[PDB]
Nucleic acid binder design. Structure first.
Ligand SMILES: [Mg+2]
Ligand SMILES: [Mg+2]
Ligand SMILES: [Mg+2]
Ligand SMILES: [Mg+2]
Ligand SMILES: [Mg+2]
Ligand SMILES: [Mg+2]
Ligand SMILES: [Mg+2]
Ligand SMILES: [Mg+2]
Ligand SMILES: [Mg+2]
Ligand SMILES: [Mg+2]
Ligand SMILES: [Mg+2]
Ligand SMILES: [Mg+2]
Ligand SMILES: [Mg+2]
Ligand SMILES: [Mg+2]
Ligand SMILES: [Mg+2]
Ligand SMILES: [Mg+2]
Ligand SMILES: [Mg+2]
Ligand SMILES: [Mg+2]
Ligand SMILES: [Mg+2]
Ligand SMILES: [Mg+2]
Ligand SMILES: [Mg+2]
Ligand SMILES: [Mg+2]
Ligand SMILES: [Mg+2]
Ligand SMILES: [Mg+2]
Lengths: 205, 53
RNA sequence: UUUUAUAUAUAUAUAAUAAGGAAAAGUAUUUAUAAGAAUAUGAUGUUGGUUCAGAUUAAGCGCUAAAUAAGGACAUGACACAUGCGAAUCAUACGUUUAUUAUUGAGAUAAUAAAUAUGUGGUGUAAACGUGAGUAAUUUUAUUAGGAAUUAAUGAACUAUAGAAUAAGCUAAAUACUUAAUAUUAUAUAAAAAUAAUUUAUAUAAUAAAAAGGAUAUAUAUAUAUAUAUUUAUCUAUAGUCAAGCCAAUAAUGGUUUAGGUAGUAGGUUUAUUAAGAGUUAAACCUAGCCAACGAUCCAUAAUCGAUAAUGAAAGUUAGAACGAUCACGUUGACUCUGAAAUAUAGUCAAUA
RNA sequence: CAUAUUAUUAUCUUAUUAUUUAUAUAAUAUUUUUUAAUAAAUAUUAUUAAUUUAUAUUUAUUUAUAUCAGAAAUA
């Protein structure tokens, strides 16, 4: 049959309808006493110019098409070279819009800080517990709400996570202890049983 | 696609038919009837032996 | 261990408790094969080179030499050559020349014998033989169960089959030459698939391209023709056999103190040319490529190889004389005819003698 | 400094050859218009040799491209 060599495209777009394909073959060298790879580069016909650098292809025997070109591409097993340009263009397009959004956010934050006395205000509300400035500050347990800190949110979130983990583990252990109770749990929900119990128990919680 | 001037597939194998090869290569004479010839008998004998072989 | 008890807040601490004992007699080929020595040192060990012990030659030379049988024999100046041979053969291609017999009257024609290859022709010298200059690959060598452009209406020269072998001219005459007659591919329609093409069948178009008679006998008639038969020839067609043309992959010496090289250069599109692909050559228009420190380009050297020779335990290393395969050359260089194939040991031109 | 041989070339010369140009009262074949010499019959009418004419196959001539080999230059 026509000679067939598996290869990787190493140069493309330099010439018209011609690429360089990197063919590796197994040879035995006696002086080393080793099977080693021997490498060559073939000038190959690419009609349609589909193949891109980095793609994994055949190059198959053909009539002489030029002085140095005797092989033609037949198919592309791996389209990595093709994808490397599509992803490039998509990355450019997406980065532009994401840049624009984040720059808008930064400009907005600059405006907020430009607009820009909390201690004095809070003390004025505290002493009140006068009327007009108090109302204006209101527009600008209320003291507790105005001073609620993000750390409390972190504390409650941490407690939620720990409670969830511990409850899951204790229910798993409890159901695993009584094997029949595990089967009842499975049937009500409607080593394989172990995974099914784990899934159902976490879905419960 | 393949190159413009090339053939996508290799030439198809020409499967010999032994009966056809025998018929075309060595064909029995149509004119069986012939008269006496000194060299004609020898030529006929040689041709028959070669065809058989 | 395991299980359980009490106590304490599903878990924890203490206490007790433990299921693993079975038996039986008899039922070679081993493979391939690697040896060192002398010389350092005041002496020792080690590194280290040098030399030696073995085998062999395309051998030469010194001394010596009986016969027979076989295998080799200009490796150097691809330096120059006196002399003789190495490619002729056909009288059944055509012509000539004689002698006798016969009839015809210096000749004419037959029959029988001969000569004639200093005239016109056919076939053979692209082989074989010898050589190794060139060639480091741009076409060379080796190998592949490698290919296509998917190689010609190619037979070179035999086999098997069918056909045909006609007319003129010029030769003094012809199987010599010319002129003429006659006898796969490209399209269109379908079919399939080994399909993004190929193949198959059909119908057309042109295929459309030839030839040659001699030697004998007889049979006719009127020496002339003719008609057969036997022999040897000629042309065409199909198939076979033997063959050719082109490309791919891997390998093929030394020097980078030769590091950059290449502009037809690398690729693309067409056209001319071939049976056939391709910057192989010729023309045109585009792109900027291609090779290279895993060594390009350049230079030097060299015919290449084997189931050949030598050597080694072997991997390998050396040779390429002898046997065999391939290439190139026939004093040097280029081109041309013929041809299927030649830059032919041909021809032409030039160079050398 | 001197000798030598391969290689090349924006240079010079060029055998032969391959294409390619332009020309031929240039030929040869055939096709016409015509002229001589000749042949059969009652003014001929055709024939061969020469005149003019336009298609092929070449010859001489020159246009260009390449080209063995030679100088010149370089290595
Ligand atoms: Mg091409
Ligand atoms: Mg000593
Ligand atoms: Mg020795
Ligand atoms: Mg002898
Ligand atoms: Mg010699
Ligand atoms: Mg020799
Ligand atoms: Mg004779
Ligand atoms: Mg003669
Ligand atoms: Mg020869
Ligand atoms: Mg020989
Ligand atoms: Mg004649
Ligand atoms: Mg003839
Ligand atoms: Mg081309
Ligand atoms: Mg080239
Ligand atoms: Mg060009
Ligand atoms: Mg080098
Ligand atoms: Mg040599
Ligand atoms: Mg040589
Ligand atoms: Mg030899
Ligand atoms: Mg050698
Ligand atoms: Mg010899
Ligand atoms: Mg020669
Ligand atoms: Mg020569
Ligand atoms: Mg000589």
């Amino acid at each position: 049959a026509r000679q067939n060599f598996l290869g990787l495209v190493v140069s493309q777009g330099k010439m018209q309808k011609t690429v360089k394909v990197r063919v590796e073959t197994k040879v035995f060298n006696k002086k080393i006493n080793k099977e080693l790879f021997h490498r060559r580069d073939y000038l190959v016909h690419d009609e349609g110019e589909i193949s891109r650098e980095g793609d994994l292809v055949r190059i198959e025997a053909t009539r002489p098409l030029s002085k140095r070109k005797f092989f033609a591409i037949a198919e592309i097993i791996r389209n990595k070279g093709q994808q490397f340009a599509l992803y490039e263009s998509e990355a450019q397009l997406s980065v532009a819009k994401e840049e624009a959004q984040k720059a808008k956010e930064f400009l907005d934050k600059r405006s907020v800080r430009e607009n820009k006395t909390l201690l004095r205000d809070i003390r004025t509300i505290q002493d009140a517990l006068t009327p007009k400035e108090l109302l204006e500050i209101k527009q600008r347990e209320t003291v507790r709400q105005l001073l609620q800190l993000d750390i409390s949110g972190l504390e409650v979130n941490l407690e939620k996570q720990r409670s969830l983990i511990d409850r899951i583990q204790t229910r798993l252990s409890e159901l695993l202890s009584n094997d029949l109770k595990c089967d009842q749990f499975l049937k009500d929900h409607g080593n394989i049983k172990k995974n099914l119990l784990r899934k159902h128990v976490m879905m419960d919680m | 696609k393949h190159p413009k001037g090339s053939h996508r597939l290799s030439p198809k194998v020409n499967f010999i038919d032994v009966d056809n090869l025998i018929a075309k290569t060595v064909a029995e004479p149509q004119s069986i009837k012939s008269s006496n010839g000194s060299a004609q008998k020898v030529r006929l004998q040689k041709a028959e032996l070669r065809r058989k072989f």
